[PDB]
Design a binder for these strands. Structure first.
Length: 82
DNA sequence: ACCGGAAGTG
DNA sequence: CACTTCCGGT
């Protein structure tokens, strides 16, 4: 799953240059959109992956209450731990 | 950047 | 299903 993959990355320091926790409890910011996508596209063997396609995937999680967007902030989503 | 509909995949 | 692909919107 993607939200899995995100968390997989987010509990490893060796990717803080790419993606890390910021602001509130469950908030996280993608520092390098294009790189992340490349890695997810490596993992899913989909070479033609990019943030546009990944970001759509994320928005589908809004209805499913796993994620939502922190408005105003760039590349900043937040998990639904409630 | 960020959204969400729409059609396709295995 | 859980995305990927595409694209015309805000």
């Amino acid at each position: 799953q993607l939200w899995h993959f995100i968390l997989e990355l987010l509990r490893k320091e060796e990717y803080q240059g790419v993606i890390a926790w910021q602001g509130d409890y469950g908030e996280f910011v993608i520092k390098d959109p294009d790189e992340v996508a490349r890695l997810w596209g490596v993992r899913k063997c989909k070479p033609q992956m990019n943030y546009d396609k990944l970001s759509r995937a994320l928005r589908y999680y809004y209805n499913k209450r796993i994620l939502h967007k922190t408005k105003g902030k760039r590349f900043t989503y937040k998990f639904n731990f409630n």
